[PDB]
Amino acid sequence: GTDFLTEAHLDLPMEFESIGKAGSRLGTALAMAVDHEINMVSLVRNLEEFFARESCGWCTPCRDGLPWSVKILRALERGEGQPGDIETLEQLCRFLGPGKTFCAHAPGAVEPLQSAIKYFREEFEAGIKQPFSNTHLINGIQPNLLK
Amino acid sequence: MDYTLTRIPLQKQEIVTDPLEQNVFMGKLNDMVNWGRKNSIWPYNFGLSCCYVEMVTSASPRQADLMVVAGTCFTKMAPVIQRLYDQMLEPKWVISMGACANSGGMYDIYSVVQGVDKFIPVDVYIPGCPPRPEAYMQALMLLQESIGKERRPLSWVVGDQGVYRANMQSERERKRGERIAVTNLRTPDEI
Amino acid sequence: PEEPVYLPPRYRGRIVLTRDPDGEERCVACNLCAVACPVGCISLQKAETKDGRWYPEFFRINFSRCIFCGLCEEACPTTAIQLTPDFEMGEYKRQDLVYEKEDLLISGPGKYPEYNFYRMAGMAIDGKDKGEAENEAKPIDVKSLLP
Amino acid sequence: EPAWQTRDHLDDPVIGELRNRFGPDAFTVQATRTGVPVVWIKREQLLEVGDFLKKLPKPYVMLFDLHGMDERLRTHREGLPAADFSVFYHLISIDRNRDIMLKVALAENDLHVPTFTKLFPNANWYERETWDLFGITFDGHPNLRRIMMPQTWKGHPLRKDYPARATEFSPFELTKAKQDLEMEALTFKPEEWGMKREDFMFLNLGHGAFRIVLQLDGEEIVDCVPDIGYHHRGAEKMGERQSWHSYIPYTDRIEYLGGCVNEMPYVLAVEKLAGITVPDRVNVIRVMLSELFRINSHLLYISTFIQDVAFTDRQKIYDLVEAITGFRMHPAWFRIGGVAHDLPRGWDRLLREFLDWMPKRLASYEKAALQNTILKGRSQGVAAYGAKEALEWGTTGAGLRATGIDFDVRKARPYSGYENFDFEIPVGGGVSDCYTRVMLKVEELRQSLRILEQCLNNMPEGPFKADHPLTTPPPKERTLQHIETLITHFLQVSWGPVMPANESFQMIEATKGINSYYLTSDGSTMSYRTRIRTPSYAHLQQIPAAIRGSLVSDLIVYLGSIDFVMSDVDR
Amino acid sequence: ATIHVDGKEYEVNGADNLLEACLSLGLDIPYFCWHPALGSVGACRQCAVKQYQNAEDTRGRLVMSCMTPASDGTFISIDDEEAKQFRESVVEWLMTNHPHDCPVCEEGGNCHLQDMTVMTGHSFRRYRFTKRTHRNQDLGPFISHEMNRCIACYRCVRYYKDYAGGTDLGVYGAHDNVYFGRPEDGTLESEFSGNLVEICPTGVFTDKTHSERYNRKWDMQFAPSICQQCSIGCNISPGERYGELRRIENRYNGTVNHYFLCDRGRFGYGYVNLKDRPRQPVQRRGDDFITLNAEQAMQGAADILRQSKKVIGIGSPRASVESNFALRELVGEENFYTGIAHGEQERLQLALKVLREGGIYTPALREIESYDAVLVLGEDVTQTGARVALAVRQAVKGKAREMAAAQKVADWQIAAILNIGQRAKHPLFVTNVDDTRLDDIAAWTYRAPVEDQARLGFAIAHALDNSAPAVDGIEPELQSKIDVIVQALAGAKKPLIISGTNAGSLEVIQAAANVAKALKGRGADVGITMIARSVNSMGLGIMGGGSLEEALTELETGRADAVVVLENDLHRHASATRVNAALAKAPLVMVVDHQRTAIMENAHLVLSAASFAESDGTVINNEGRAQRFFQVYDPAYYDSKTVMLESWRWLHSLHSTLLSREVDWTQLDHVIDAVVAKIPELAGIKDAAPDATFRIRGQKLAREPHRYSGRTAMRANISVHEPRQPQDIDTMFTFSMEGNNQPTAHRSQVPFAWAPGWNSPQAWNKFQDEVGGKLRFGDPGVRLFETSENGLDYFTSVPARFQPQDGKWRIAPYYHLFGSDELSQRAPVFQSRMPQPYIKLNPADAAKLGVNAGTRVSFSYDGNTVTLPVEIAEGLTAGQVGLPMGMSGIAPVLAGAHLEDLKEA
Ligand code: SF4
Ligand code: SF4
Ligand code: SF4
Ligand code: SF4
Ligand code: SF4
Ligand code: SF4
Ligand code: SF4
Ligand code: FES
Numbered sequence A: 001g002t003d004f005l006t007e008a009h010l011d012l013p014m015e016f017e018s019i020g021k022a023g024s025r026l027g028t029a030l031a032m033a034v035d036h037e038i039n040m041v042s043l044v045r046n047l048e049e050f051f052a053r054e055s056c057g058w059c060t061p062c063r064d065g066l067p068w069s070v071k072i073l074r075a076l077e078r079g080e081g082q083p084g085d086i087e088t089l090e091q092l093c094r095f096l097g098p099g100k101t102f103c104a105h106a107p108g109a110v111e112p113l114q115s116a117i118k119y120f121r122e123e124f125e126a127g128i129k130q131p132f133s134n135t136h137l138i139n140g141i142q143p144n145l146l147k
Numbered sequence B: 001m002d003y004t005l006t007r008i009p010l011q012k013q014e015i016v017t018d019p020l021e022q023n024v025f026m027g028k029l030n031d032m033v034n035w036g037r038k039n040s041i042w043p044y045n046f047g048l049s050c051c052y053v054e055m056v057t058s059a060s061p062r063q064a065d066l067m068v069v070a071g072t073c074f075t076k077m078a079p080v081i082q083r084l085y086d087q088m089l090e091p092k093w094v095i096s097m098g099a100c101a102n103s104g105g106m107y108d109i110y111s112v113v114q115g116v117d118k119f120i121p122v123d124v125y126i127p128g129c130p131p132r133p134e135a136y137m138q139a140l141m142l143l144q145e146s147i148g149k150e151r152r153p154l155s156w157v158v159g160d161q162g163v164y165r166a167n168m169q170s171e172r173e174r175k176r177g178e179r180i181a182v183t184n185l186r187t188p189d190e191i
Numbered sequence C: 001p002e003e004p005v006y007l008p009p010r011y012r013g014r015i016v017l018t019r020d021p022d023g024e025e026r027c028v029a030c031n032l033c034a035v036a037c038p039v040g041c042i043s044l045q046k047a048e049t050k051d052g053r054w055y056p057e058f059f060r061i062n063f064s065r066c067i068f069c070g071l072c073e074e075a076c077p078t079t080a081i082q083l084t085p086d087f088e089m090g091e092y093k094r095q096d097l098v099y100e101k102e103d104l105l106i107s108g109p110g111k112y113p114e115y116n117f118y119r120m121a122g123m124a125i126d127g128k129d130k131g132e133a134e135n136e137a138k139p140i141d142v143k144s145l146l147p
Numbered sequence D: 001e002p003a004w005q006t007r008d009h010l011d012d013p014v015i016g017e018l019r020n021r022f023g024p025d026a027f028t029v030q031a032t033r034t035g036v037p038v039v040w041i042k043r044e045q046l047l048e049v050g051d052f053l054k055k056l057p058k059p060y061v062m063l064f065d066l067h068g069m070d071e072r073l074r075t076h077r078e079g080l081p082a083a084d085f086s087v088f089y090h091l092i093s094i095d096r097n098r099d100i101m102l103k104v105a106l107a108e109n110d111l112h113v114p115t116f117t118k119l120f121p122n123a124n125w126y127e128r129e130t131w132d133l134f135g136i137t138f139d140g141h142p143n144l145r146r147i148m149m150p151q152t153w154k155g156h157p158l159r160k161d162y163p164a165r166a167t168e169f170s171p172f173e174l175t176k177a178k179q180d181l182e183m184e185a186l187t188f189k190p191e192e193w194g195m196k197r198e199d200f201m202f203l204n205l206g207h208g209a210f211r212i213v214l215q216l217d218g219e220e221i222v223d224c225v226p227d228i229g230y231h232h233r234g235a236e237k238m239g240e241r242q243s244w245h246s247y248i249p250y251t252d253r254i255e256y257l258g259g260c261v262n263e264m265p266y267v268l269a270v271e272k273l274a275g276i277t278v279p280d281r282v283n284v285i286r287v288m289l290s291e292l293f294r295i296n297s298h299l300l301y302i303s304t305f306i307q308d309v310a311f312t313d314r315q316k317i318y319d320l321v322e323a324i325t326g327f328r329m330h331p332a333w334f335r336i337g338g339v340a341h342d343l344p345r346g347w348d349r350l351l352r353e354f355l356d357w358m359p360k361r362l363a364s365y366e367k368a369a370l371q372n373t374i375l376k377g378r379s380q381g382v383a384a385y386g387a388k389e390a391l392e393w394g395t396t397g398a399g400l401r402a403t404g405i406d407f408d409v410r411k412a413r414p415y416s417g418y419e420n421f422d423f424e425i426p427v428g429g430g431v432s433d434c435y436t437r438v439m440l441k442v443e444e445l446r447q448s449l450r451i452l453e454q455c456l457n458n459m460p461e462g463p464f465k466a467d468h469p470l471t472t473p474p475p476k477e478r479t480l481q482h483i484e485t486l487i488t489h490f491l492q493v494s495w496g497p498v499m500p501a502n503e504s505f506q507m508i509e510a511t512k513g514i515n516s517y518y519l520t521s522d523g524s525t526m527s528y529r530t531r532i533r534t535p536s537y538a539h540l541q542q543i544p545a546a547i548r549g550s551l552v553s554d555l556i557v558y559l560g561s562i563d564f565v566m567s568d569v570d571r
Numbered sequence E: 001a002t003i004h005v006d007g008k009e010y011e012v013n014g015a016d017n018l019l020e021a022c023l024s025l026g027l028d029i030p031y032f033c034w035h036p037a038l039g040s041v042g043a044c045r046q047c048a049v050k051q052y053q054n055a056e057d058t059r060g061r062l063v064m065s066c067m068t069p070a071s072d073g074t075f076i077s078i079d080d081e082e083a084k085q086f087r088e089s090v091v092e093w094l095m096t097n098h099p100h101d102c103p104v105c106e107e108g109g110n111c112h113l114q115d116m117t118v119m120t121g122h123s124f125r126r127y128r129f130t131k132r133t134h135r136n137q138d139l140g141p142f143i144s145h146e147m148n149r150c151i152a153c154y155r156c157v158r159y160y161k162d163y164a165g166g167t168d169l170g171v172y173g174a175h176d177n178v179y180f181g182r183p184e185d186g187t188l189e190s191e192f193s194g195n196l197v198e199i200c201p202t203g204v205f206t207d208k209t210h211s212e213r214y215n216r217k218w219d220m221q222f223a224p225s226i227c228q229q230c231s232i233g234c235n236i237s238p239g240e241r242y243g244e245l246r247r248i249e250n251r252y253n254g255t256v257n258h259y260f261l262c263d264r265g266r267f268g269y270g271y272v273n274l275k276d277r278p279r280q281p282v283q284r285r286g287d288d289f290i291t292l293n294a295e296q297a298m299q300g301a302a303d304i305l306r307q308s309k310k311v312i313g314i315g316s317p318r319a320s321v322e323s324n325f326a327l328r329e330l331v332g333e334e335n336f337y338t339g340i341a342h343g344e345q346e347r348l349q350l351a352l353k354v355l356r357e358g359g360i361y362t363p364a365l366r367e368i369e370s371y372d373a374v375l376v377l378g379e380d381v382t383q384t385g386a387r388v389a390l391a392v393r394q395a396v397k398g399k400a401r402e403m404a405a406a407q408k409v410a411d412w413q414i415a416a417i418l419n420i421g422q423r424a425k426h427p428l429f430v431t432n433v434d435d436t437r438l439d440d441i442a443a444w445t446y447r448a449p450v451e452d453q454a455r456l457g458f459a460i461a462h463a464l465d466n467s468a469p470a471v472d473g474i475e476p477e478l479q480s481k482i483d484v485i486v487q488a489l490a491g492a493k494k495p496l497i498i499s500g501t502n503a504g505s506l507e508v509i510q511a512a513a514n515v516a517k518a519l520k521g522r523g524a525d526v527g528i529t530m531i532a533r534s535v536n537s538m539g540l541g542i543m544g545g546g547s548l549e550e551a552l553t554e555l556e557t558g559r560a561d562a563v564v565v566l567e568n569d570l571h572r573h574a575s576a577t578r579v580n581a582a583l584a585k586a587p588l589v590m591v592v593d594h595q596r597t598a599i600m601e602n603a604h605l606v607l608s609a610a611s612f613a614e615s616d617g618t619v620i621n622n623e624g625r626a627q628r629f630f631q632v633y634d635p636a637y638y639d640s641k642t643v644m645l646e647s648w649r650w651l652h653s654l655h656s657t658l659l660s661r662e663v664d665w666t667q668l669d670h671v672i673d674a675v676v677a678k679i680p681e682l683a684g685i686k687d688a689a690p691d692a693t694f695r696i697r698g699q700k701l702a703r704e705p706h707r708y709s710g711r712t713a714m715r716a717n718i719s720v721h722e723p724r725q726p727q728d729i730d731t732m733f734t735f736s737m738e739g740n741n742q743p744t745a746h747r748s749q750v751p752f753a754w755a756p757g758w759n760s761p762q763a764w765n766k767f768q769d770e771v772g773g774k775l776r777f778g779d780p781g782v783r784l785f786e787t788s789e790n791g792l793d794y795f796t797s798v799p800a801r802f803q804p805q806d807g808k809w810r811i812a813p814y815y816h817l818f819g820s821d822e823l824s825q826r827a828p829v830f831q832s833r834m835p836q837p838y839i840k841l842n843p844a845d846a847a848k849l850g851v852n853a854g855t856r857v858s859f860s861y862d863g864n865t866v867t868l869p870v871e872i873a874e875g876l877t878a879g880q881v882g883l884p885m886g887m888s889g890i891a892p893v894l895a896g897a898h899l900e901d902l903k904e905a
């Protein structure tokens, strides 16, 4: 529910305020360790899959942004990432913070995404390989190709 | 086919058969009269706003026995149109160019008469904002056919003094097969 | 008049109604073309096939009023109404210039050959179950065992 | 800062001059998107405010426009005086290269405005049009009558309560008008026309077709009131009826030779209302099509003026227009996004074929027009006026630059990326003669060929529609395979694009002069007010000021030398 | 309280919501889950603005406008960068999985999601993944279901459960595969399920009756009219196209019918587009039914009425005030007979006596919801006129609202109010012959014969005030519940008593008046409402006249040889054989009607009248207010051979041709002047709407939107020449779009709500001074009734107990919503909704007869043995038999009558 920290934040005392100023929070004070052999993209994909499928169905942003994060992270897993996905995830994290949603499920969902983008950005960049293609041809209509 | 008889916009028309099926010299002489009226047609292109300039790329009244009403039917110019219509001499025919002469034609507003059909009879209509000169020419052929199948009084002394207009088959029913049987078209992304 | 005149493919002449590659009429009997008409020379009424698709019960166009400016073709979201390069019109009576549905619907796809609107719509269609359209997932049941 | 921003223009020094002259009070500055300072002047201060503007060190010398507006149904009126009606005067100063707007508020009970013809003599037809279309009366006005509608017309058309529909056509009224036309010369009363009552013979002399009454001293002509309004289509009243998107063909049909040039100002003013900044490719396409239709109009004008004393050129331009757009004459191709479709895959070949064959046609045209001594002798010294009868009678066409006044809209107030195209405008010297006007339009045609060559050289490959959500219609492929684009296409086709309540104004160098659109929006999907200022209106108003002391042949040679269009005059 | 929006001061209420405060100011904030009548939740997050703490603040915080109080000193911003892009993101998330089927959708130009997607300015799509789908359900004959269009803003379930009290709709599923519907496939049995069509901002719940013969919103020609299906008189907007009425929408009025209709008025418009309706005047000689125009019909009818010795006019409770008055002027006052039974007319007259002479205030439909204890005597309110029952549900929820207000939680958040409530209900005591649909919320339901309900009311009145007459024979087990009702009504600040003429007994009205008077005696703010039978039965009672029985006796006696029946079937109010014999004995029978009734056979002249869609008229509500309905379309626009004129027009021209031998196609305002000059108690009907010479800034008001499409091709299939527009000289409306429908226009009657950027039914909030309140510039219809200074007397006539008798059966009405209205059964879509013709029996009575449930039984009435299938009623009493009134063959006047020979068939 909390967000990832690096080795430099391992020396902080496990307190509410001490981890609060580190861009994080203490939470349930049960630490979760991730080693070097595990891709951050897959781990955050599993986190977002849990938060998407285990959320309630009340309010819009969690309901229709956590599956979008799940699909983006699956595309990053399979190497089918398109330019404009990491920025979409950052905007999603900024718009799923406290107060923007009905309850505090979504901020705790998007804190791991925020820390994964902030710290382990290079794997998310490496998940993008194929160019952006949302629309397909109609073969009788000239497309609005912009520069 | 059967005809409508006009005899001496508000008058009444009745649908009867032609009087030629009831003499053999009158049949061929009326055919020659209709042939002569069909082949030599003298138009009077009325000078209006923006269909008249379009048929420029394609004379005095009362020698031209035909009026082509081009532009928009303005309420100030509608008396001019009717007066110029009664100037011409029988027989006379009317070809309407553009939507503005058939109907109101994109101007359903206070200062526009909804076509010359409101006040003068029209023989041939041409639809659409400015028609091509080839559309005017095909309307000329259609009206030539309509004139060629007619029964007008050959003299004002002896004979039936009534004008018989033929009920032509409509062009949408005649050309229905060739229009419905169109499978594919060129894409608009090229020239 | 002997030699035919060449006209470009993007020529605004006679209005036709267009079929899809499947064979039915593309027209879903909305009123976008009737209301985008500045003259107001399009009239139609929606009827519904007993299993699925909409179609026009009638489709009449007053060509004595039409100015061939192409707003209806531009406003069709099904590419059903199109403006052919054919211009050889002109009739004897104005009443016969009102082209009905049988005078407009042609037997093939015109300027937009491969497009089909119902392959994008999400409604239940004869030959198209729910979740069979493009970029559309199969319906997960409300009673399904997965979370 | 974007060019479409709602500015108040209190930094304009003319506002400071007005504050120094008439005090900080007594006029209300309105913040619009027109790009000009708009001041609400009280009714009794109007004549002295105009007199002060006429006596500035760089005075406002030309009355660009003068028309009314029905404020009764206008809901969004914030920062505006309590007005049932309003009369706006648009004034242009060329030395300042600026323009101001003067709005006078009126109530229902007293629709009386002091006349403006004692200051600007071109205000006569504008005040007659305001009295015709609205109910506004002008005090101290000679022959104040209906100019667009006949005198036997009851209501006022541009009023909001007047229905904008064609009523039932009664033949009885048409027979009254036919009988009136039969006795028009018999019961002619030269006091309603504003005429002087034995040589003087009164006759109605029947491009377009319009009557012009004539007073004869033998053959020499002493007074003339050109009767206009015979081609009145009600473009503005239909502008109050159609939406922002359906009015584009009506903007094509005011001037048929211009067409796309005439749907340019409406599109630009609509984009100013919507806050849309179109990309550079859209600007280049607009410039190319506008100069293409300008070449069409100039070639037809030169051919018409030279015929009485051409086919393949206009056919090739019309073939190119048919390739780019729909049919040739009225394209209806400029959208709020900027164009309807993208350019096809063969326009380079057609434009290069057009541009590699027209310079020798220009050489032939100049060789013809420089050697016809009969045409030069017939066209020299006729209807001579230098800068004074052209600075006060409108006259914004080729005559304004024939007087030597260096004022082109494409250079003074550039639009649609015309600053990126290098072209030197032509200006005449001294007398605005007819032959000088024709030579100026020949040089304008050469400059338009140069602009087309520049457009063919460097065409950007960006989008053909802007990314703004108010681009009507949205791009078609995204409409067909995305749902938000389908929403925008649906609601911009069905009801119309909802635009915020602002006031916009676009001034455009047309094919024959300066055409301008002035759009007032009430926040709805229609236009609350559409005003189309036309050059040919002011070009037809100046015939009495120029052909007093000439013959009928001189009058009709001048009429042919004027590039006016009757449908352009009567809207 | 004052607020600051975008650095601009505004004076709003402090006790209401911030979203509704901003929408009341004309500001635009998008919203999905908020409704003015349903409170505020957070099911969407669309109304987000940025709130600051003090005047000088830059960061702010994104809050919800519908969940922030509009307290004094708030500084909010709507159109800054962050809130605008967040609302764009929310509409992007909602439209992430939304089907690409807008042109094939029923909403189209009526969709709120389209307006709020355009308003947020979201056009480009960057979601490239797959969408979400759901299976649809069969919700019945009226509601089409398309669950894929849903955005899960929870408004439908909140309305249907919290507001409507229905037990069908609900939320199923989970995070993203959420569902809104029924647990199975079946018909929504709530009487207010039709409001889900406009409650849903998407195309999920749509109108099936409008799905068939569908057109878009801008193609509809609208008019403000009054629903003619029962006595509540809910304000409706019927809209037509191509000469047939296509869809009835809600018309806002903050006094009667604010936001919600019932299913009968929403889906009973199918009788006006039947192809068997009279369209031309038809006259018979022998067996020849020839067709006349208007002038020949008037001349011939005037000739036969002149040659007659005495004329009698039989009015109807469904015709307007103008039509009934025109009949009252065509025939004499001394011979003018209201076409209702003597007992039903007597009940109507005493109900009117309690209304305008009982000295007790009668509330409107909106202010029923403010009462504290409701006692319904005899009436099946939820089935006769259901909108009063919905207001009764709201009045019951008023106790939970009061308990929430005691805890200082704001009234616009209904979740906390329902949390505090927890089945805390205001006292509702309903009495009926069987079960009702209000029994789930009622404090007590009394299943008893009608006389026993009357004695219960008399006992309540006696125990509330000893001056009332006493009741002998009350059992103590019933006396305890009598005491329960007495202490419930005595402690209520605003008690409400509901009765009506459909109960079939005079004494129920008497007992309700006695209870109301006893509550008024002890200083309570007691109100009374009476549910009448038809739309203008109260207006007919105010106009007055003889009964239908007196007309029939005048017919077979031979005193009158000419009868003019205006819009009456005449089989609902009297026996069929007697009416048929009386009409066959009459030498001249004229029937002025728009529905092909049974008496049009062997009727010597038939005048094709006009329905509410094709006529102008005035109708009086059950509360007594006189509203007026306007013509929607000209019937002669398409197929101009039909004349189809107004009923008052027909009768006035017939009277003019009778007197001066010439026709006079009069005007509506002339008839209104004649009514207010002849009848003094009807003088208030020239205050409902202004004259035909009323203009806002010189122009009329448009029946159709500005984007009315296809004007030049609408009639092109029969005439390419466009005809002139129909001229409406009767009223303030023009038949074209050249009018005025501005929200900021000085008028009370709105044909349809449309605002730029608000194409949905949620454009009504632009037409009101404050949203969810009264309409701006007043409300349509004036009350016409003033409370008397003194009340009536205590009605001493207390009936005895209902003793069952052998060989005879007391008939009890049931009054189904979809089958007990004469104009509703003729609608083809109702015929699948009405139950099969049945008859209810007690288990003891069925055991005595030996008949099992579901089998046929035969009973004889008027010498006619008819066989109906039985069903067992648990709540019915012994010695009674139950029938659905209003059906084919079962008259509504059969209530309270006797029955003989219940033999098994
Ligand atoms: S944020 Fe909370 S209330 Fe909103 S949908 Fe997610 S779990 Fe439910
Ligand atoms: S149809 Fe078009 S080109 Fe012809 S007169 Fe009308 S507007 Fe002009
Ligand atoms: S081309 Fe234009 S005028 Fe013709 S039907 Fe289409 S929208 Fe209407
Ligand atoms: S032609 Fe196209 S726009 Fe018109 S109703 Fe059919 S699908 Fe809709
Ligand atoms: S079905 Fe309609 S009202 Fe119900 S939650 Fe979905 S969008 Fe909202
Ligand atoms: S409910 Fe609205 S957004 Fe959804 S498909 Fe229908 S019209 Fe489109
Ligand atoms: S409660 Fe009565 S008046 Fe209201 S909609 Fe229902 S049937 Fe009509
Ligand atoms: S309107 Fe839904 S969160 Fe406020």
Ligand SMILES: [Ca+2]
Pocket: E615, E616, E631, E728, E730
């Ligand atoms: Ca009427």
